[PDB]
Paper text:
Here, by studying CRLs in the SKP1–CUL1–F-box (SCF) family, we show how neddylated SCF ligases and ARIH1 (an RBR-type E3 ligase) co-evolved to ubiquitylate diverse substrates presented on various F-box proteins. Notably, numerous cellular neddylated SCFs and some other CRLs have been reported to associate with ARIH1, an E3, to form ‘E3–E3’ ligases in which ARIH1 serves as the ubiquitin-carrying enzyme. We developed activity-based chemical probes that enabled cryo-electron microscopy visualization of steps in E3–E3 ubiquitylation, initiating with ubiquitin linked to the E2 enzyme UBE2L3, then transferred to the catalytic cysteine of ARIH1, and culminating in ubiquitin linkage to a substrate bound to the SCF E3 ligase.
Numbering used by the authors:
A (entry chain R): 21 to 59, 67 to 108
B (entry chain C): 17 to 55, 84 to 148, 157 to 686
C (entry chain H): 98 to 106, 271 to 328, 406 to 554
């Protein structure tokens, strides 16, 4: 009838992102960035729903204030933890 | 003068043919010599020179033409007496050396010069020839009365002329070099050239090897009792050129024939002998490399077909060959850098390409076999391994690893096997796993072992988080089951997306509660549950004897689909579980192979007959197993 | 899967080697790299050495004036400076090989083993390959109108350039003596990073070609 006593499932952690390249360092989104790799590196978001490493978009905005896939202004919308 | 010359001549004749006179005689002689030189003694110098020459001629009147064994007993005794007497005479007429040879020849040097002229007479060749004939008892016979040779050698060395050459400096061994050392060296060369070949023509070369070492030791010893010190290096070079450095061909042939045997005691002898000369080890290193290469290759040729499916035997054979020849290299050849390099090159060559790789038609079969050996060695087996033994065996695996060159194939295989071994909760010792990863990282860098470190820390963090879920569950009435989960990363583990499953209604409460709990502690994260590898427990509160099943989640879905009825088909099951066709075929085949589910037929070969979508599946209510807690899995 | 054949004396070509006497025959030309088995390779279409990211026509236009008022001269000076620097370094790689090898014997005789000079050889090979790719990636970068997808490329290749300079700096001096357990680790961690980065650059270039993303 019931026949259930215990269950042990296996699930994968993954960021909630439609595409996976970070489009700045071209690494995999889950991997380390170009800075943390040549030696906390989290994923930031934006209003236009694009995803980049934190330490990539940081320098990109330090130079120019445009989201680098869409010629529009950029401001943070959701940090990643 | 004249009234002084006769008495002084008497005194000088007294001092020679020594009779140990008293102080009065020598003091009065000195008084005479001082009396003359005050009133500038050139005529006295002339008289002394003429007297010395006349006495030397008188002495030569006897003792010349004896030619053997007696010109030594003559010459050494005459030389000792003459040298002592002349030193005393230099004592007597010592006012000449201070105020007439300061405005120019000291008397002792004059006596040495006159005796040198006593050397440049037939005495020179006879004495040296007899000395060489005496040393020609190198063969045997303790007849070399060393006082009959050291005296002659010291005479030659002392006779190095210094009559205002520059001034008294030190050992002027010109006469020694140009009158005795040359003949001695030439005769040594001739004697050794003859006897070495005479011996080598009759006996195996091992005995010649022993004899050559003995002769070198002997000739080093001889220069410490007979000759002068500044002949050791030159005599050593001549003996090294004659005994060895002129038979390298037979040494190389014997070296090969020794390596084909196992004599590890005289290989050390040959290393010593050949290393004594300049760059004679050139052929030895190459020959050793070739031999050890062929030995290892033909050694793992013996396993043949049995090795290709047993990692243990293959890695054991490689380790055995390496161990034996490293043991030989570290004892005989004194850990010489060249021989160690030869061993390393040959080990690389015969590990990489050999009978097993040839049979498998690729050179990436050895790293796979090593990785499978390490797998089979770290799994949780029946025996409980001892820590020291396990650590030692991992250390040996590291050597055989360091000899391979495509260290990437090994990483892929090790990552796959470690993934399986960690997911299925089936591992021997976390300490062993951590140590193995640590030494891989130490031998190949941080970039090599990043995925493995993440794969490890991820299971650690999963174990952490499951306890926190248990803690939080004390306030939310855990419905009916134990929920243990392992949340892995996504870029590290070698696992695919999913297999299109539909969750049964018996698990949805726990699924939703845990996904909501995970969404709480993290900002944005997507758990992509994969059911293709996840097991549990069933209790079967439906049968007669209260069994217990232990199978994957697919069995759970299919079995729980029978909570309503027992008359479902392949299509009817497919509708409610949404599983792929061939996967469902495999799982139903496994179920029917087990005694739980049977077809319409009673004793058919259901394990082989394929099933069609319009085929009923009947729940076998009479199921019974001998033991409890039946494990239905592959 | 590119089937080509090498033989002796629109689908056949002569070998630009100084005195090689062979013919290269291929199934169909795609400006792919072919090896003449005489020790030289070149792309079958144009005739110069193998150039992976940059197309042949731009190589022609760059090599015609290989050596426009005020700023174009500055851009040309910068790009040609980098290109000639890499070419001058590459022409002397025989000296680099001999230097590292003689270092290998020198360091091995001072009480040190063989596997160490082995990893040194591997590092040198990777360094030379990375320089050879940077060579032509600069050429590709020059004929490119600035937009969003060009800043990213010019920013990645600068980092790869810096890493290569770091690698080459490590070798010469910091292989000095008796510090293997760290110098080795640093060299390995550096050349793996360099190789991965150059693979990323080549992938970016070819994907841009496929997706029609650049502007000239
Ligand atoms: Zn980072
Ligand atoms: Zn990034
Ligand atoms: Zn955007
Ligand atoms: Zn050619
Ligand atoms: Zn071309």
């Amino acid at each position: 009838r019931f026949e259930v006593k215990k269950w042990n499932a296996v699930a994968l952690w993954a960021w909630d992102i439609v595409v996976d390249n970070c489009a700045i360092c071209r690494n995999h989104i889950m991997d380390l960035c170009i800075e943390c790799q040549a030696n906390e590196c989290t994923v930031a978001w934006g209003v236009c729903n694009h995803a980049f490493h934190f330490h990539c978009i940081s320098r990109w905005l330090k130079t120019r204030q445009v989201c680098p896939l869409d010629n529009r202004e950029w401001e943070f919308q959701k940090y990643g933890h | 003068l004249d009234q002084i010359w006769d008495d002084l001549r008497a005194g000088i004749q007294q001092v020679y043919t020594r009779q140990s006179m008293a102080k009065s005689r020598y003091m009065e002689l000195y008084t005479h010599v001082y009396n003359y030189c005050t009133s500038v003694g050139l005529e006295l110098y002339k008289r002394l020179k003429e007297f010395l020459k006349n006495y030397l001629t008188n002495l030569l009147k006897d003792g010349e033409d004896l030619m053997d064994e007696s010109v030594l007993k003559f010459y050494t005794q005459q030389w000792e007496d003459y040298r002592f007497s002349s030193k005393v005479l230099n004592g007597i007429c010592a006012y000449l050396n201070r105020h007439w040879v300061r405005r120019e020849y000291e008397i002792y040097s004059l006596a040495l010069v006159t005796w040198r002229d006593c050397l440049f007479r037939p005495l020179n060749k006879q004495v040296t020839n007899a000395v060489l004939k005496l040393i020609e008892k190198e063969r045997n016979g303790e007849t070399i009365n060393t006082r009959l040779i050291s005296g002659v050698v010291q005479s030659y060395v002392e006779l190095g002329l210094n009559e205002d050459d520059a001034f008294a400096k030190g050992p002027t061994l010109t006469v020694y070099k140009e009158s005795f050392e040359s003949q001695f060296l030439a005769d040594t060369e001739r004697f050794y050239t003859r006897e070495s070949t005479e011996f080598l023509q009759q006996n195996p070369v091992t005995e010649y090897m022993k004899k050559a070492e003995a002769r070198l030791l002997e000739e080093q010893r001889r220069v410490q009792v007979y000759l002068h010190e500044s002949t050791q290096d030159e005599l050593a070079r001549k003996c090294e050129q004659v005994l060895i450095e002129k038979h390298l061909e037979i040494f190389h042939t014997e070296f090969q024939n020794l390596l084909d045997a196992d004599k590890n005691e005289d290989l050390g002898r040959m290393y010593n002998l050949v290393s004594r000369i300049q760059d004679g080890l050139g052929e030895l290193k190459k020959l050793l490399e070739t031999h050890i290469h062929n030995q290892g290759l033909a050694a793992i040729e013996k396993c043949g077909e049995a090795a290709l499916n047993d990692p243990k035997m293959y890695v054991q054979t490689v380790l055995d060959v390496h161990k034996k020849y490293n043991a030989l290299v570290m004892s005989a050849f004194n850990n010489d850098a060249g021989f160690v390099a030869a061993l390393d090159k040959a080990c690389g060559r015969f590990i990489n390409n050999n009978a097993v790789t040839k049979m498998a038609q690729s050179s990436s079969k050895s790293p796979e076999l090593l990785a499978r050996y390490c797998d089979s060695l770290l799994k949780k087996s029946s025996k409980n391994p001892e820590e020291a033994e396990l650590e030692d065996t991992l250390n040996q695996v590291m050597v055989v690893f360091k000899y391979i060159e495509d260290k990437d194939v090994f990483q892929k295989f090790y990552a796959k096997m470690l993934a399986k071994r960690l997911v299925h909760q089936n591992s021997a010792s976390d300490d062993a796993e951590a140590s193995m990863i640590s030494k891989l990282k130490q031998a190949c860098g941080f970039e090599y072992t990043s995925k493995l470190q993440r794969m490890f820390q991820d299971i650690g963090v999963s174990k952490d988080l499951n306890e926190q879920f248990k803690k939080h569950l004390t306030n939310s009435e855990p419905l009916d089951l134990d929920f243990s989960i392992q949340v892995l990363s996504s870029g590290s583990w070698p696992f695919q997306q999913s297999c299109t499953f539909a969750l049964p209604s018996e698990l949805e409460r726990s699924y939703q509660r845990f996904t909501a709990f995970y969404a709480s502690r993290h900002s944005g994260r997507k758990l992509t549950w994969l059911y293709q590898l996840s097991k549990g427990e069933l209790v079967t509160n439906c049968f007669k004897n209260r069994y217990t099943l232990q199978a994957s989640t697919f069995q759970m879905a299919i079995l729980l689909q029978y909570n309503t009825e027992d008359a479902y088909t392949v299509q009817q099951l497919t509708d409610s579980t949404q599983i792929k066709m061939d996967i469902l075929a495999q799982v139903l085949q496994i179920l029917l192979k087990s005694k739980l589910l049977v077809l319409e037929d009673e004793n058919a070969n259901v394990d082989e007959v394929e099933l069609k979508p319009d085929t009923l599946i009947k729940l076998y209510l009479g199921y019974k197993n001998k033991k409890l807690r039946v494990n239905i899995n592959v | 899967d590119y089937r080509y054949e090498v033989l002796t004396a629109r689908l056949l070509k002569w070998c630009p080697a100084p005195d090689c006497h062979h013919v290269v025959k291929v199934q169909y030309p795609d400006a792919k790299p072919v090896r003449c088995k005489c020790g030289r390779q070149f792309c079958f279409n144009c005739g110069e050495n193998w150039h992976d990211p940059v197309k042949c026509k731009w190589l022609k236009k760059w090599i015609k004036k290989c050596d426009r008022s005020r700023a174009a001269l500055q851009r040309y000076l910068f790009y040609c400076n980098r290109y000639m620097n890499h070419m001058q370094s590459l022409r002397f790689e025989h000296k680099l090989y001999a230097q590292v090898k003689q270092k290998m014997e020198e360091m091995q005789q001072h009480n040190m083993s063989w596997i160490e000079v082995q990893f040194l050889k591997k590092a040198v090979d990777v360094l030379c390959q990375c320089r050879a790719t940077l060579m032509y990636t600069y050429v590709f970068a020059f004929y490119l109108k600035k937009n969003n997808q060009s800043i990213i490329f010019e920013n990645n290749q600068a980092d790869l350039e810096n890493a290569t300079e770091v690698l080459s700096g490590y070798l010469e001096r910091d292989i000095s003596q008796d510090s293997l357990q760290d110098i080795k680790q640093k060299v390995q961690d550096k050349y793996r990073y360099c190789e991965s980065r150059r693979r990323v650059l080549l992938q970016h270039v070819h994907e841009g070609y496929e997706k029609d993303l650049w502007e000239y």
